[PDB]
């Protein structure tokens, strides 16, 4: 049920802002900052910003049909993330381990 599944989200984004993950989950909690040094030309290259706050906010105000709508904005804030940055970046290896945490516990869902 859609109702069921979209309080398992809201269990998968609260693991995600858990102090266990946030060692490499603090640089999605809160939207990019594009007025912060470099990030000048993130805009031009990220046509949809999301990060965890707007996520949570989303399904507070209740945007998600179900899972897959709520799945797809988790990865769209990774996928930005893996197309913004270069691959070596200190982010991208923060995205995967966070990544991992969400895809395990969605599969299992
Ligand atoms: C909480 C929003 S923030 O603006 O305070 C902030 C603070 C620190 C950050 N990175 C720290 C760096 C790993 C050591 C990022 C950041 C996020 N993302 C998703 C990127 O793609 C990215 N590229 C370059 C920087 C960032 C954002």
Redesign the pocket.
Known sequence: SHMEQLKCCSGILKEMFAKKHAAYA????????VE?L??HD?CDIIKHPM?MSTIKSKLEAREYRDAQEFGADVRL?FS??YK??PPD???VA??RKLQDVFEMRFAKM
Do not use: I, Q, S, T
């Open positions: 603090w640089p999605f909690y809160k939207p990019v900052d912060a470099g990030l993130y990060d804030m930005n993330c913004y940055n970046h200190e982010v923060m995205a």
